[PDB]
Write a protein that binds this ligand. Sequence first.
Ligand SMILES: Nc1ncnc2c1ncn2[C@@H]1O[C@H](COP(=O)(O)OP(=O)(O)O)[C@@H](O)[C@H]1O
Ligand SMILES: Nc1ncnc2c1ncn2[C@@H]1O[C@H](COP(=O)(O)OP(=O)(O)O)[C@@H](O)[C@H]1O
Ligand code: BEF
Ligand code: BEF
Ligand SMILES: [Mg+2]
Ligand SMILES: [Mg+2]
Lengths: 361, 361
Amino acid sequence: RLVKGYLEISQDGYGFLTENLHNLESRVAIVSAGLIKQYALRAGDYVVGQARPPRENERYATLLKVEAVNNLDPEAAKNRPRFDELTPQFPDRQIRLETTPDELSTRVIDLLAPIGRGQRGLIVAPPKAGKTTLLKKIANAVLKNEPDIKVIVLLIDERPEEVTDFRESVQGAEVIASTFDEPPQNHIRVAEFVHERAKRIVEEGGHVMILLDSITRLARANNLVTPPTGRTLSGGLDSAALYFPKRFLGAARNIRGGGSLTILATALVETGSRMDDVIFEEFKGTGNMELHLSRRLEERRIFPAIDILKSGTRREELLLGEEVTHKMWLLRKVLADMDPAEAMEMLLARLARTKNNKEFL
Amino acid sequence: RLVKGYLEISQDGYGFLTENLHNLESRVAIVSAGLIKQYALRAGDYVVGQARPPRENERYATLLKVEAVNNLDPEAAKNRPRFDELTPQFPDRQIRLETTPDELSTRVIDLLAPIGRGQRGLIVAPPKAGKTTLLKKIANAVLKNEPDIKVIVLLIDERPEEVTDFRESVQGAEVIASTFDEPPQNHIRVAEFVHERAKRIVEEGGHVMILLDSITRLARANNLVTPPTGRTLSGGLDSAALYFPKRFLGAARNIRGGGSLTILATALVETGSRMDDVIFEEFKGTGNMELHLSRRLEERRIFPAIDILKSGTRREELLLGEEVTHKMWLLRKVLADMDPAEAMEMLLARLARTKNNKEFL
Ligand SMILES: Nc1ncnc2c1ncn2[C@@H]1O[C@H](COP(=O)(O)OP(=O)(O)O)[C@@H](O)[C@H]1O
Ligand SMILES: Nc1ncnc2c1ncn2[C@@H]1O[C@H](COP(=O)(O)OP(=O)(O)O)[C@@H](O)[C@H]1O
Ligand code: BEF
Ligand code: BEF
Ligand SMILES: [Mg+2]
Ligand SMILES: [Mg+2]
């Protein structure tokens, strides 16, 4: 028999499991140490095993046996590469980008910031400047382009109506949310839970993509959670308290042996408080691709309102041929003189004629 | 004998009720736990209850019995959905906007800031820039457009003369005020009282609108109440005090099963202290529509002096049909070019000709 959950190991070798609500609910389950030792798995796995109801003198269910682990033979689970020891590479198994629901705006997305397997991406915009629905569109496209990829969406510190909008509009993909109604400890719990789950899932050589609403909101939430860390960075920020979100985003990587972990998250800047500017800068050095969204292009209601000059990716050539290298080099040389708004509208007119590759052809 | 009020449950199951002034008075009455347990009501769910002539040896009145509660059968109260569990949606039961008392400025308001049942709205303006009587006009219009809606007005940290002006000019709708003469404790008491009152009134599937004068003044009141923040935010804010106005404003929501809660509150920016800019940004991400008011437009005495480009709402299409969707799309494409003062003067000249719908026709 297999009850299933996300293992959270307690100090004493036994652990706990949560339910499908992806929040601590009364349906938690307890996990014994002996079986995990028997199969010697790594923390945060999608654990399954046989269990027995709460015994007399026992207030909660307890583990009796295990039959199959992580949907695989437990013996095979005994030997596997460790996630943190996987040889990282640059994204070399690119996800070819072609999505129907909006071929033009999605053309802008593809042509300005490519997305590949294991991309450590980050999108940075001021408040109320085009984030959540953009993430929604990206998720919807991915759920059609690569049905094999396990796509997970995480929402921290956001409005409930957006949560329900996604849950209805995601068409069955794992949508996890934690509205601002919950105390920040709930945010941290859910975030780290999904972090470990994704890590252990990717460790199996799989391709995982996490779309994180409100990452700089999550950073402010850490600051609230941030108990001291010591010295105050400029703007009320903590020095090392960004270490946990730093590792969270740094998980995004390409692995040369198969599988990948790509995180795209929404960051806030120009909020009038140095805290957010410093947070964004601290993340900018850790992500491998950044998407600046210019507040003025949004004020002009040009979507996507991307600050093309400031925006850019790292190692396009590994995702883009020398031919695309040269054509985009020419585009940079030329559009440097074209204004962002006029450039955007010009590109809109041109690409409405043909697909990205058809435009290249 | 029926006493009607808002049960404030104390620690020991016995609670308190207040009087019509919505301020602590000598007329507060005590309540017993047993009947509340019998009818399984929720905090602040409009309580109608019986009692007796208190006995001797009791320093305060004590409750005997209950006859009818929530103006409904108390037994049915035993099983009902809870407010915090209601499935929130975007406002989809729109309140069609047609306001006679001044149809021009209110034309500007309706055509720039849609109002629907459950609108979590926010309006921002520097000091002395057109707030209080604007809220007054909104309240007066609502008291003619939807007589079925229970309209409540809350005034925090404001001048008494405005309080009397409203109480005379509201024509019987619930006007609650707490002048700055009172210490901040009174502000907090009244604010949370109204919070619970509105929440549990909406819990009955009803439509409630709260018009909150002085929301940023209320934020500064919290700052005076800001007990620590731990680390001091830019300007002197609290991390945990802002949680309470955050939840207060986030109460505003649209419910898919009927009823809604709409809060429109007045906010302050450009006050020369980082506190207010930080607070405005903090609320901006929590409200579902924010209305900037430009100080320069007010200096020109343009009412409403709205910074049209900066101002905007979320999910207009959910309130605005495809036809209106495209119409406002064209209007945003065009009016971006018109300068605020001349833009609004032109808008007055044009829309003064016809009603909004007639202008569309
Ligand atoms: N492509 C788009 N076009 C128009 N509006 C958008 C688009 N993408 C997102 N938005 C809007 O931008 C708003 C800001 O996104 P969000 O990340 O929720 O803000 P924050 O996280 O700063 O509170 C969203 O509420 C959404 O309605
Ligand atoms: N449409 C308007 N035209 C002219 N004056 C207005 C208008 N609306 C509000 N006011 C004025 O703006 C003042 C602002 O007071 P208020 O905003 O309540 O103080 P505070 O900002 O301290 O809460 C009011 O006293 C009112 O006289
Ligand atoms: F309103 Be969010 F900060 F984009
Ligand atoms: F009229 Be408000 F105080 F700006
Ligand atoms: Mg949003
Ligand atoms: Mg005013």
